[PDB]
Amino acid sequence: REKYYITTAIAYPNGKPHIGHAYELIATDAMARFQRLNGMDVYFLTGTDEHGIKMLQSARKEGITPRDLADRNTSAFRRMAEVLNSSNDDYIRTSEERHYKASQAIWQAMVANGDIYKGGYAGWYSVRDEAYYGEEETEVRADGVRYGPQGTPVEWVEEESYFFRLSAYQDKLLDLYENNPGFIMPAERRNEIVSFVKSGLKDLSISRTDWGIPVPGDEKHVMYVWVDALTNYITALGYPDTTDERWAYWPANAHIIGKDISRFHAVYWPAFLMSAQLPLPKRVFAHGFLFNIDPFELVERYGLDQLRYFLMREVPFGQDGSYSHEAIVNRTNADLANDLGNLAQRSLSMIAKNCEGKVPQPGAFSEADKAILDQADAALETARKAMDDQALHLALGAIFAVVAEANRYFAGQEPWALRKTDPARMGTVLYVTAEVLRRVGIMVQPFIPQSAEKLLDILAVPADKRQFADVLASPLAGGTDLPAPQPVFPRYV
Numbered sequence: 001r002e003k004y005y006i007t008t009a010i011a012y013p014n015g016k017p018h019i020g021h022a023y024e025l026i027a028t029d030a031m032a033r034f035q036r037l038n039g040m041d042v043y044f045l046t047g048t049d050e051h052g053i054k055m056l057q058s059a060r061k062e063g064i065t066p067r068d069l070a071d072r073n074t075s076a077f078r079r080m081a082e083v084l085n086s087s088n089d090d091y092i093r094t095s096e097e098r099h100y101k102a103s104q105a106i107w108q109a110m111v112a113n114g115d116i117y118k119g120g121y122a123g124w125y126s127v128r129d130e131a132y133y134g135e136e137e138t139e140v141r142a143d144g145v146r147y148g149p150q151g152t153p154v155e156w157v158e159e160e161s162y163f164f165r166l167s168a169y170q171d172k173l174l175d176l177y178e179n180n181p182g183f184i185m186p187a188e189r190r191n192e193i194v195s196f197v198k199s200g201l202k203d204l205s206i207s208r209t210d211w212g213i214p215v216p217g218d219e220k221h222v223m224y225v226w227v228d229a230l231t232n233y234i235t236a237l238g239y240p241d242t243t244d245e246r247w248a249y250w251p252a253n254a255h256i257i258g259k260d261i262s263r264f265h266a267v268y269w270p271a272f273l274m275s276a277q278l279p280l281p282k283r284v285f286a287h288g289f290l291f292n293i294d295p296f297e298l299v300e301r302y303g304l305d306q307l308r309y310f311l312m313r314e315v316p317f318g319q320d321g322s323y324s325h326e327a328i329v330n331r332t333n334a335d336l337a338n339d340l341g342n343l344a345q346r347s348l349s350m351i352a353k354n355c356e357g358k359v360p361q362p363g364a365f366s367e368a369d370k371a372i373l374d375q376a377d378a379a380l381e382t383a384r385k386a387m388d389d390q391a392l393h394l395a396l397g398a399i400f401a402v403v404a405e406a407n408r409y410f411a412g413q414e415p416w417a418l419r420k421t422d423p424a425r426m427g428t429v430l431y432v433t434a435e436v437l438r439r440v441g442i443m444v445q446p447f448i449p450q451s452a453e454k455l456l457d458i459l460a461v462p463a464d465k466r467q468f469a470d471v472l473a474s475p476l477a478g479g480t481d482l483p484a485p486q487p488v489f490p491r492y493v
């Protein structure tokens with residue numbers, strides 16, 4: 001069984017969880033579940049990034065230690081994962097001892113390759129981004145203060161600092177981008193990165209000089225928060241122990257991240273991995289941002305699956321998008337409550353009332369029967385091709401187009417009228433509808449897991465007949481008992 005490793009960015013837990021974090025986790029969860037159902041051996045990581053100057057300063061404001069703050073706020077992030085029904089296999093915190101040892105190992109690996117030196121710089125520095133900047137990347141605003149590109153103040157500094165020889169990787173990075181056209185996506189991101197690297201790379205500062213991982217052999221220094229943070233992805237697999245059973249999951253198939261942190265993952269990270277003699281992830285994919293506050297309240301007001309569906313359907317993955325009360329209510333009423341849920345309820349109640357709650361024996365399929373059935377099978381192939389490109393909206397779009405067409409099929413067959421005229425044919429039509437519903441049910445599991453389970457329970461589908469392979473392999477059999485149908489998607493109160 002082919003191995004598939006997917007990760008989310010690890011959030012700074014310096015406050016409460018926000019919807020950005022929830023969005024990223026839901027989308028990564030969907031992708032992970034999709035691949036499980038598609039027959040892969042999946043490892044799915046998320047976690048928290050607990051070092052950094054931004055954590056230090058938040059700790060000071062609250063008047064506690066950064067470990068204290070990290071420990072307190074992290075519980076909320078873990079609780080968010082449980083509430084969003086996240087299927088992650090591990091949870092990483094960069095305060096753990098395994099990470100400390102991982103980060104010091106990858107560091108040593110880069111030193112062994114000759115890519116790390118101690119040196120002197122003189123330039124603008126932002127304390128909060130732990131990064132130097134060139135005068136060109138800065139501006140003096142009306143308050144008379146010079147700001148760097150990432151929004152924060154820069155001051156002039158002359159210090160010794162450890163450096164990574166990022167200049168030695170310009171050409172190897174450009175080859176990576178030619179040879180692997182899907183390494184950093186979507187396209188708008190690819191071009192930012194390719195252009196940034198074509199225009200020249202300066203060596204990168206990777207230490208400062210008391211909350212972080214000490215640079216091995218020189219404890220007066222601590223590792224820049226990004227070197228540390230990126231290592232999370234290989235820490236979770238047992239690095240540096242390459243005989244750990246998890247290690248075969250490396251290289252990651254997909255790092256899901258937000259667009260504001262592309263450069264770290266598509267430039268720094270591969271450079272570091274090359275240096276440490278490790279293989280590179282197959283893809284980094286950057287989602288956009290959401291605009292209107294608290295994920296827990298949203299789940300409470302709308303339902304988890306309603307929110308999951310909305311976010312993954314209404315925004316093209318990669319692009320920025322909007323959400324509002326009215327949008328979520330209307331789109332989830334239309335697609336879930338009405339289109340899918342009411343097709344299930346009407347059809348399954350007709351089977352309950354008119355066929356003794358047994359799946360009816362289908363006869364010859366008509367042209368219209370074969371068309372809707374085939375459209376369902378076709379949706380699986382489209383969903384697969386979509387998810388390979390992180391196109392969650394297209395995967396869901398294809399599956400729900402089958403739902404829309406199934407309502408038209410149902411209405412147009414007029415099965416109530418057939419009750420009197422032709423009960424054999426009524427049965428065939430109810431069969432088809434039930435069978436289309438089984439195929440949809442299987443396909444939507446990754447996106448709306450609990451609701452999908454409830455819809456398949458209603459269709460009496462065994463627990464071991466809900467893989468994507470079962471869409472073609474395991475059709476409903478006439479005669480099977482079905483429990484009394486309750487609505488799966490209540491209309492919004």
Ligand code: MET
Pocket residue numbers: 008009010011012049229230231232261
């Ligand atoms: C190695 S992913 C680190 C992400 C970072 N803590 C952020 O939230 O921006």
